[PDB]
Subunit: 494 residues, 4 copies
């Protein structure tokens, strides 16, 4: 059951959060954040720049000093703090869900039942890791005792995108805080508000000042300042493959900080002839259209075996046409607006290219409302591998359906991409499932499902979809610095 929303939630936090206190930008500049359902300004937000990043980094470094409350704190207590944060988020779940919808556009029902649920599960999962990520005692040759300490990497710059504002904040804060790091986080200008409210809850939960610092602002300013900072030890970035490059170059051009990246994809969703048709159609719809199509791993190349192609397309068109686009606070709404005007225009551009290059437009193809950034659920059939809409990540409600004949053929075509974030296989056959999951060059392969995220299982890209993994035990690796201590002993024995 979904509690009724406040469709116009008050904003309480709209500044820079450093040392558990709220700050205007050094410059006093602010930027508007807009409600994409209406195109209207929600509020002004402090416009952080390099000087604000510098204040944040110094606060973080101070909190990380040997002997500080955060460094001395029992690991188990970091877990308690994470669990307390989750409880406060749960207390404020309807507010956060409404604010998320207001600022991002996703349906409130989904904000409440999905994003907020996943946030809680992520924070709670990582809370349990805080005191369990052991180093090693090692049977080295000779008269020595050798062991490893798993220490925190240090001051962690985290730049997060607008598509799942709260969930991405949690995917970043969970592992970083579980491992004893400190954070300078840059949130998306499209969706700064929910992360800043969470900062208030971080303070309420009792995290020492400077442990989490949040700097709203723009990428070429605030994000760049983080990536290039001489006292930031590690940077994590999620966004486009384009800005990804800028990050890795800045790390190399500054202090050789450690880098992980989560970038785009053009993920293949492969429907074999023996798939359960009803399930495959529904899941392929979800795979593409979930979150207004704004998902890093959207199943944006739907490959369908020729024998079932005609029926699959027919069912897929019927399902896209039934999808309800509208006010994301309305319980019936399945699809909200796209996040902002830039994305709106980009998607319309991709739709135009699909028409121009001769993909068969089967439904949708245009704007879905006279106000707000709403786009009709759009399906192109008879898509070919060389088409722009088969190659580039659209990040909107635009489905590509491609026909194939053999399992060998589809592997090659699926893997013929510079991306490799995710893939899926729909089939009843044991051998086909195993053949495909091994052969597909992707970070996650879903079998008879899609977008199944568990805090327990890692996620991240092959190839130019990024590097490193988030979630699960793996998500702790980028947040750990390993120290070997090797001690002379009188006489080593087994």
């Amino acid at each position: 059951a979904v509690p009724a929303p406040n469709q116009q939630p008050e904003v309480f936090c709209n500044q820079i959060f450093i040392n558990n206190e709220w700050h205007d930008a050094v410059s006093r500049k602010t930027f508007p954040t807009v409600n994409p359902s209406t195109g209207e300004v929600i509020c002004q937000v402090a416009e952080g720049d390099k000087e604000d990043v510098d204040k944040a980094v110094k606060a973080a470094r101070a909190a990380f000093q040997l002997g500080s409350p955060w460094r001395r704190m029992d690991a188990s207590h970091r877990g308690r703090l994470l669990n307390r944060l989750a409880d406060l988020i749960e207390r404020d779940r309807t507010y956060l869900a409404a604010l998320e919808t207001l600022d991002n556009g996703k349906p409130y029902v989904i904000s409440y039942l999905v994003d907020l649920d996943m946030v809680l599960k992520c924070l709670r999962y990582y809370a349990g890791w805080a005191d369990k990520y052991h180093g090693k005692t090692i049977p080295i040759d000779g008269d020595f005792f050798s062991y490893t300490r798993h220490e925190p990497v240090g001051v962690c710059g985290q730049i997060i995108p607008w598509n799942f504002p709260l969930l991405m904040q949690a995917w970043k804060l969970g592992p970083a805080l579980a491992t004893g790091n400190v954070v300078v986080m840059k949130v998306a200008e499209q969706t700064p508000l929910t992360a800043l409210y969470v900062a208030n809850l971080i303070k309420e939960a009792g995290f020492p000042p400077g442990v989490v610092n949040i700097v709203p602002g723009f990428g070429p300013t605030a994000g760049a300042a983080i990536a290039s900072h001489e006292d930031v030890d590690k940077v994590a970035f999620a966004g486009s493959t384009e800005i990804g490059r800028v990050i890795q170059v800045a790390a190399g051009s500054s202090n050789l900080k450690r880098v992980t990246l989560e970038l785009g994809g053009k993920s293949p969703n492969i429907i074999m002839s023996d798939a359960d048709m009803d399930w495959a159609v529904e899941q392929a719809h979800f795979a593409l259209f979930f979150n207004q199509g704004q998902c890093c791993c959207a199943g944006s190349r739907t490959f369908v075996q020729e024998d079932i192609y005609d029926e699959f397309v027919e069912r897929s068109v019927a399902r896209a046409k039934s999808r309800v686009v509208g006010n994301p606070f309305d319980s019936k709404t399945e699809q909200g607006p796209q996040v902002d005007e830039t994305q709106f225009k980009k998607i319309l551009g991709y739709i135009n290219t699909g028409k121009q290059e001769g993909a068969k437009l089967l439904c949708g193809g245009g704007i879905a409302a006279d106000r707000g950034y709403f786009i009709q659920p759009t399906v192109f059939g008879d898509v070919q591998d060389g088409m722009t809409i088969a190659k580039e990540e659209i990040f909107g409600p635009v489905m590509q359906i491609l026909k194939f004949k053999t399992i060998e053929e589809v592997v090659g075509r699926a893997n013929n991409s510079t991306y490799g974030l995710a893939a899926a296989v729909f089939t009843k056959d044991l051998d086909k499932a195993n053949y495909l999951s091994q052969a597909l060059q992707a970070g996650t392969v879903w079998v008879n499902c899609y977008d199944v995220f568990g805090a327990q299982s890692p996620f991240g890209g092959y190839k130019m979809s990024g590097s490193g993994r988030e979630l699960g035990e793996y998500g702790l690796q980028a947040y750990t610095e390993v120290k070997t201590v090797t001690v002379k002993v009188p006489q080593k024995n087994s």
Copy 2:
């Protein structure tokens, strides 16, 4: 390629092995070992008893003392020694395979290509573990540094059966020596010879004296003396469920040693109607008949879905009839003799039992040869769950085929056993495979295969089929004693 065998290999080792030297029993007693293909005595072997076990245990304890060569040796060097032993066994592979066949009865081609190959793979795999089984550094609360050492358990008594003499020796020595334990091993009276030859290779490889001690002799004497010994730290026993019960009592009545057990089975092999018929028929044949049916995990309840039952049975009977029983040194032979007269009689008893209780005798059922202990490949059809041949381990070439209708039914029937060693499922369907593999209460579930052992994957029983696991990383757990060291420090920091 299989090198031509020496059909009358010379015997070089037939005494008690302690401190890298050969000894008679204190009593001077010897016992004959028999060639089961001919029923003739091969040679006499020293008959170890309590006093000889006591000498072995003292030697092992001495080798385990702090500061000893074996205790001080680098972990990596334990690996070098295991690798050296493997190389010596490989040097002597053709001889060992022939001796194995001579004393045990299994076909020489199989001793050569299967048993010896697996021995080499097992030792080489565990050589790799010797310096990699790390303890942990642990982020305990308060101002402490806490860590664990993985130490050897100490003096390990190992009692091994006659079905796979060399391979079972390797399964036991591999992990015990990788982890720096010392061993007192009791080999089967039916098949002492190959293990004793391997003792010469242990000395040759360079193992310090007292690290491995081997005492041939009988169960209620030498085996019991190990189990009950007040200075044995750990016992590993493989054999009948009946004797397994004795060992745990003897252990708890002595010094509370740590015990692992590898016992019998009545493992279900489930053939779904969508299975590959030709593959399932061949695999079900192998699953039962492998090694003269003398396999702990033999597929001795072959459940076949009713729609394919008739065809399956026809094919299975033709395959049993075609199976060549004969001189295990003849390359055409698929089945050698049973290991001894006691087993021979027991199997004839079970064949008569099946006849008496109304199972349909479809082929075989009698003695296959004049000399030795040869039994015809025997297939019973229309076997019912309450039949003795459906419940008790026969340990011979006697196949039970049962009919079932539904997947739900067969789970219940398969699991209705006090055994739980292995199980298998033959199906092309992904959901059926996952359903059954989860539902079956067995230590190993094979899917579209049978008897697939890898040194890398653990093996052992649920229920009264055993406890603990052999092989893989898991096989090291029973051979490690864990010590926590917790040290006050001036100020703990993450």
Copy 3:
């Protein structure tokens, strides 16, 4: 900050707990539990026997059936339920701490700040393990996919002692429930009450019926019934070594259930001449006297280097004489009564034996109050290795001080014991600490501290002190049954 206690708390739960309901014993018999501070009856408790244990086992087996709520529950949700239970115990902390003191005798301030704190930390620790104890995927030879599932062992019998009633319950429930097992728990007849109240909170927390069942009663009856039960898969026992044998023999005589034991100790605390004197005197006092001396790992052989012996003894005697024995609800009380009349008389007997065998009585030596089971803190000097008080676990406020000269001497003397639960070393020297912690044959070695338990670090005995480990990741191993699934694939690639 310790809340004011209810010095005569009411009792709400005093029956058998099965399927989340309270039951009288089938026999309708009850037994009294006594307040050791006064020797008066608190209340009657249901006296469970074999029939009651049978009801509990059947309930647990039902809760463990494939497809049941507890079996289908997400691993993360098992975590949630453990966390909820912890929260409820924290809600009722003041009450439970007072009840613990009422039934056990330990000081309220200690029940509140130590026991309850450790109970919460243990449950919260294992809550975090619920969804993190991964199986493996394994690069087996050949065209196969092989992996392991870590499954629950099943129905777990858990028999817990009276020394830390609430903490020992938590040490048992945490790992068992985190791993999805079900439990039949037998609590000590001396201290049944707090565990029964906790059962009420298990129901309140939302654990499915049958997941935890508690049968209070007597050892030769209910305990034996659990250990011998044909449908109990695993047994964990903590108590005396005598019953340890009983338990392992029963298990070998019944169904081959998996067994773990935590038994006595006579743990050595070694004070080197270079120790911090004041710290070593205070910690040696704590190591022996903690919990009325009723600790499995009490430092009951205090070895002191000859050069500092006289001063250490002088200071230790002064400290023992200053230790306040009294009503455990009085804030000034450091030592409460012994748990019951049996222990009270047994300890007095050992004091008499010490006096008669020529140990030097330096202080204490008799009863400390006319009512309740109070014993004076007692210190024996010039204790020798062969003395009864140097060999047998007293489990009372009776300190043994032994003189030694050299580090090799103390190692050998410390290790010359059939026990090996714990040991400690007080020294400022790096090499001495390392030499000793390696050389000491004990499950836990403390360096410049004593009785430092974290949920994070494993604990358990060498030799006759027990087998298996509790706490840490290691605490999960005894509660896991490992299944290997090995699947034929079209073509294995790396």
Copy 4:
């Protein structure tokens, strides 16, 4: 025992190694490699450039194709190939040790007993990892089976320095090959020869063509081509912090390949007043002077507590003055020449700067021979933190001794560096040892020892000394790509 060297070993391999064949450069250009002891040319070596790197990458890519011999090979068999490679290197040990000395300058006795020993131990260690680096089965929420595959990263570019030519080749090939990767290796122009002979041994050992390809040539050409290559998945670079930046920029500017870096150090070696003097002096000498001072982790800031400074310095100067500099083939020689003229001049320039900036020149300071690149062991006293010789990595036989008062003071001064590769502490005190090992910001902290490497224990930098770890289980992480497979199942149970 050290076999007599051939002081003029024949060169057999001097070309580009691709597909197990030898190739001239496309350009047909060659470059000379020089003997640093004489300044004379040994032989010409193929000058690989971008076009040759391209050929190597294509060969490696083909070798990595799904279904290839290398991709299909059992993991255990990769292990066998690594062990076979080690056997071959052992067979040719005396030759390789001499050739290493000829091309690099290090003493033959060291090449033989240290470098070759370590190479063998590294390869044999990683051989054991081949079939043991498991992925996970994961208890994700919902009706799913989730697991991870540990797959190879793919085509790995490996750029290795001249200081430990064979050992660095082994450190890179061991983990890459153990995990099933393919390699394009660029070796240092100063020391190409031994790596090329090993390539001949890789062929001999039976590695499939293309699995290891070696391109000799210059940095700005061949090295750059690797770092910038669009079909290289992963680059590992060891060398100066200067070139480390270029690598990371190249990766970000090309295809976002994965990057690990092993870079410079200025490692602090801290001698507390309570240290064993003779030991600390000898170990500090080794720490700095080992390998002609050409070690990433040289103890090039020797901090000595004021109370022992004068004595330590006197003893240090005596040891430096008696260190034998000469022909590296003479068994008496402790120090050979520097690797080349560039280094020779750079080091002399640092010595001049040291004198100019006011450090006290205690011994050495100049050229040690009239031919070859020999420099006198040089000791500077009264070094201050702000001096150039205290800040910049010299990479030669130049020792810096600094005085300090307190342990708190020395932590700050030690950590006040942009480097963090290693550090050491000499003390008899347990608490000072644990204090310092925790506080020091370095990848390896040695205690009462220095330069203790073991294949089992990881090594790598903090801060600008690099990122990622080599050796140990950790060395496998950078060579692994993690894939999650998440499978819908009928009903998930524990």
